[PDB]
């Protein structure tokens, strides 16, 4: 039940293979159509639903998929 924007965020996280995952700057770099609040909300939703988790700190994310 993902919005278009949540799916876009999730796809970017899925595509980063680094063990610490991608970071919030990587999301801002790519998601140039989205407000910072929308990116943050999508990260919250994805994290609450178990699609992603934070890794080395609260600004880095990896997907469970």
């Amino acid at each position: 039940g993902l919005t278009v924007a949540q799916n876009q965020v999730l796809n970017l996280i899925k595509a980063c293979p680094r063990p610490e995952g991608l970071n919030f700057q990587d999301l801002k770099n790519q998601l140039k159509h989205m407000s910072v609040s929308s990116i943050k909300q999508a990260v919250d939703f994805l994290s609450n639903e178990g699609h992603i988790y934070s890794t080395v700190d609260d600004d880095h994310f990896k997907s469970t998929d």
Partner: peptide, 26 residues
């Protein structure tokens, strides 16, 4: 990554997979 960082990441990975299972099961 350091030992400690890998330990924390794996704990986080398991917490998230747990949340996912709960959502898939509800």
């Amino acid at each position: 990554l350091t030992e400690e960082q890998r330990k924390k990441i794996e704990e986080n990975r398991q917490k998230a997979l747990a949340r996912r299972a709960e959502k898939l099961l509800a």
